RNA sequence: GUUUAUUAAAAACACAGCACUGUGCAAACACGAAAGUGGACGUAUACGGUGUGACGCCUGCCCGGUGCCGGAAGGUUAAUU
RNA sequence: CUUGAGUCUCGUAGAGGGGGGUAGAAUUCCAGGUGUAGCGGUGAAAUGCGUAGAGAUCUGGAGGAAUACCGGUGGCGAAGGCGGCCCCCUGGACGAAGACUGACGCUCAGGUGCGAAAGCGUGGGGAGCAAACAGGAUUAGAUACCCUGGUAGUCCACGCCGUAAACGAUGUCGACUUGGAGGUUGUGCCCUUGAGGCGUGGCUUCCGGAGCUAACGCGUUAAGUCGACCGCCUGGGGAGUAC
C-alpha cells in the first residue's frame, strides 16, 4: 500500500455534493482493506486564476494510503465527475498527518 | 507587472518591474533561441564570470 | 529493484546456512528471479534500452556465476539449475 | 505498416503481395440472425451505378441502436463480417439473448458492456449523448433519437464530440468536419472498430476486386459515343468529366431539408 | 458619445514602428492614431521624439469623449515605450497605473532566425 | 518546507511576475533551492500561487 | 486475364497499385414525368466519378486562356411593381 | 583467506529510460463588439496585407509545438542524450555502521547492441520556423547575403539507415605523485546553541608544482611514474575515391 497526497478541487455551485461524493470516497478506501490517517476539509477558497472558468473553488485533501488498483478507479472517476474540477493525486512522500 | 497609486504625482516606481523582464526575456526571444550556443554561452561565457 | 519480502525469501530458499547473502548459490537465483520478474516488462515497453542496460549486465554476470559456480563444483552447478530450470 | 502484433507480408512466389488476418475469431458458424441477401446492382428496370458485381456473399446478421439497457453484456468471441469489414463480436446479455453489435477496439473475454443512461462509460456499451462526457470518442451515431445508423464504418473510425456541449448537439464527424446532431441520440461510444484491417493491399486484379468489385476503370477508351471523350490518335485534349459532371471539385449536394451543421472544410 | 472616463489604452511598440489605440475598460476600441499614420515615415520615425505626437494625436480623437482618467497597456519594447508615456498624462491626462502587456513564452515556439545580416 | 500547504512560507519566494527566486541571490544550501523550486511547479496548477501577475 | 462472333489478340482494354475530386445519408450519383429503386439493409479505413497503370528511383518552371474552388463592395442585371 | 568483483541491509540526490495524464503561458487561424486609414517591413525601399475594413483591441472557441522564471560555473547517463507538473513499470550510480561469498577478476579481432542531425519507407498531425519555388530589392550582376510568402520537413509511432568537428579531435582497468579557491552529493563528531564548526567517501570546475612537453600546454579529472589488453599510424596530392 502505497501513501498519497491526494488534494483536488469541486466546482463552486455544485459544492452541495461535498458531502456525498467526501463520504462514498472513503465508502471505497475503507473498503480494500486500506489506511487514511490525515484527511480534512479546506474549502471555498478564492482561486488565482479562471481555472475552467470561475475564480472559487472548495478543495479538499487526502493523504490516503491504499493500492493503486482502487485510487485507479477513482483516479479516473473524477475525469468522468463532473461537478469536479482540476484534480491531483501526489504519490507517496509518506504518511502525514496534521497540517493546512 | 503591477503599479498604480494613490496622491495624483505621477511619480516612477515603473522601473520596479524593469528588473524582474521587460526586454531582458525579449533578447531571449527576439530573434532566435540558442540551441548549441548555450552549450557555450552559460558554460562558455561562463569564464566571462569568475570573478 | 525487488520486493524487499520476496528477496529474503529466496535467501532462505538457497542459504546452505540462514542469512548467507552475498554468497553464489544465492546471487544466481537472486539476478534470475529477478530477470524472469523483469521479462513481462520489456515485451512492453520494448524500447526502454537504458532500463535493459543493467538487465543485460544482469544476466552478463548472472553467467559469470555460474561459470564460476561450475568452474568450481558441479555437483552445486547441477542442483542450483535442476531447480532454477534455466540452462535455456 | 504500424501495428502490433502482425499483419503479415506474402512470399513472392507467383505474382503476388499482401493479405490480413487477426488473432481471434476462431469461429466462423455464424449464429442464426441472418438473412440470404440477394445479388446484382439494377433495380426495377435498367442499371444504375455501373461496377460491382462479385459471387459468393450472404451473411447479414445485424444489429446497431442497442435499444436494450439497464442490462449487461458478454463478448462472446469477435466475428467476421462481410460486406462490412470491422469484425463484429457476439455478445450476450444476462437475461439470455444474444445480438451482435458493433466490434470496437479493446474487447475480447466477455468485458462489461451495458447500454443504458448513466452506465459503464468505458469503450464497450452505448450511453445516450446528453450524458455522454467529454466525448472524445464516441461511434456510430444517430442522426435521430431512435434511428441508429451514422457513421458505422467502425474499420478506424472516429467521431469526437467537443467535450461536454449544450443546446443539445456538438460534432465533429471523421471527415465531413464538425455537423451538429440531436443530443437525445446515443453512440457506441468506445469509438474504433478495429483498422489494422483496413491498411491492406488486395493484390491481384478480379482476384481481389471480382469477390466485389468489377471494373469501374473504364477511361476514355476511346469510342467518343460511348462517353463524352475519347477518340483521335491517341489522346484526348478536352476538359476532363464524366457524363457531364465536371468532376474536378465543382460538387454538388445542392439542399433536401438539412444543412443544420457548420465549418466543414475546403482544400 | 458615451463619455467612458475609466477606459484603457494599448501602446504596442514594434521597433521600426509604435501604435497608440485609445479603448474603453471592458476592450472596445475609442480612437487611434500612430507613428507612420503621422508625416515622418521610414525610421525617421521610431524614434521617440516622434512616437508622442502620435499620442498627441489620439488626444484629438479621445476628448470628442470623456475621459477623466484612464490606464495604459505596454505590449511592445522599443523607441516609444517610455516617451509614448510622457506626452501622455501631460497633455492632460489622469492615469491609475501602468500594466506591462508584451509577450512572454514558456519556450513554446520557434521564433524567427531571420536577421543574419 | 517540502510541500505547498505552507502556501504562506512560499508567498515570499517569487516576485510581481510570478518569476520563482533564485539561489543565486539567496544561496539557500541549492538542494533546498530544489525542493522548494518544484513545490511552485506542483501548487501553481492547483490555483494557488498565480503562474504571472498578469494573469 | 480480355478484345474486333466471321481478315486486326497487339504495343489495345483490362489489372493490383498511385493521385485527384465529389459525396454527412432521405449521401453523391443512376432508372424513372412520377411513386419508387440501385448506391447497401453501406455509412467517409464507405461509395460515384475521372486521370495513371506490379516494382525502384523521380514527378521542374507558367495561373497569362480556360474549368472549377472561393469573395460579393461597387457595375450591369429577369419576372416584378 | 580478505583488502579485489560482488550479494544482502539501510540511507540518499538526480532532465536516466519507456507508457498514460495533465495545467499555464504563448503565436495563428476561425467568430463577432469597437474602431479608422492605416498596419508590415529595410540602410532605406519594394513585394504582401487594409474602404470586400488590415492592424490595433475585446470576448470567445480549434489546434500544434515547446515547457520562460527556477538553472547553476549545476545536475544525470556507457557514448548520441536528456528540462514544468502528475501517475504507474523499470536501470544505474553514491554512501554508512555493519552482514555476507571467497580471485568471481580487469582487458577483447571478429561477434552483438545503442545510433545527434539529416534523409527513405507505412500511416498519422501539422501551431512556428524553413532547403527547394515565386515575387521584392541590393549589384556590373545575383540562381546568394536582407525583404514578402511557401512545399518537404522539424513533431507521432512503427520501422530502416547506421555517418558528424560522434569532442576532451586525449580507450579501457589499477596504484602511485607537492598543493592551492570551488561546485553537488552522501555519513562522524563539535556549548549541534550557529549562519555554521571540524575530520572523512563519489562526482566536478579553475589555477597550477615537480615532472613530462616539439612548442601552446597536461599536471591528482596527467599529456607525471609504472603495470594487463585492444585500436589504429608510416610523406603530400591522385584517394577514403576506383576495383
Ligand atoms: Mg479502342
Ligand atoms: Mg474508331
Ligand atoms: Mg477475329
Ligand atoms: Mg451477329
Ligand atoms: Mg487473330
Ligand atoms: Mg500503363
Ligand atoms: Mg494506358
Ligand atoms: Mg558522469
Ligand atoms: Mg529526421
Ligand atoms: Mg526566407
Ligand atoms: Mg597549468
Known sequence: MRHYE????????????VPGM?????????????KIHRLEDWGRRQLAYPINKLHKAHYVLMNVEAPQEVIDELETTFRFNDAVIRSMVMRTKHAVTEAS | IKVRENEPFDVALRRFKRSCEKAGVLAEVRRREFYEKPTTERKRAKASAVK | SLSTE??????????????????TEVQ??????????????????????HSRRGLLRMVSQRRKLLDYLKRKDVARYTRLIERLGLRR | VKCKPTSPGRRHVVKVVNPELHKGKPFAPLLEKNSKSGGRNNNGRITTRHIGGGHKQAYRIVDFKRNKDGIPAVVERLE???????????????????????????????????????????????????NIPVGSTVHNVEMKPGKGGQLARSAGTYVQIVARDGAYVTLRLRSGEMRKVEADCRATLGEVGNAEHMLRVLGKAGAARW????????GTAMNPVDHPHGGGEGRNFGKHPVTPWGVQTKGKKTRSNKRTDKFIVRR | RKQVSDGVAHIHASFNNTIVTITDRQGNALGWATAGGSGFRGSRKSTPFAAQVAAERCADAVKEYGIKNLEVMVKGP??????????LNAAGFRITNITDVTPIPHNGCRPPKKRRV | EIDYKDIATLKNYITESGKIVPSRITGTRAKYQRQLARAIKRARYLSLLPYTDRH
Open chain 5, 78 to 87: 522599443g523607441p516609444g515605450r517610455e516617451s509614448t508615456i510622457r506626452a
Open chain 1, 22 to 34: 467526501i463520504e462514498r470516497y472513503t465508502a471505497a478506501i475503507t473498503g480494500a482493506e486500506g
Open chain 3, 28 to 49: 544466481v537465483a537472486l539476478l534470475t528471479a529477478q530477470i524472469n520478474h523483469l521479462q513481462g516488462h520489456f515485451a512492453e515497453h520494448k524500447k526502454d534500452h
Open chain 1, 6 to 17: 491526494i488534494v483536488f478541487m469541486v466546482h463552486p455551485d455544485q459544492s452541495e455534493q
Open chain 4, 80 to 130: 467476421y463480417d462481410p460486406n462490412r469489414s470491422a469484425n463484429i463480436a457476439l455478445v450476450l446479455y444476462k437475461d439470455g439473448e444474444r445480438r451482435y453489435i458493433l466490434a470496437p477496439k479493446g474487447l475480447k473475454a466477455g468485458d462489461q458492456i451495458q447500454s443504458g443512461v448513466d452506465a459503464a462509460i468505458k469503450p464497450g456499451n452505448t450511453l445516450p449523448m446528453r
Open chain 4, 211 to 218: 469477390r466485389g468489385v468489377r471494373p469501374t476503370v473504364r
Open chain 3, 6 to 23: 520476496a528477496t529474503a525469501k529466496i535467501v532462505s530458499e538457497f542459504g546452505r546456512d540462514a542469512n548467507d547473502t552475498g554468497s
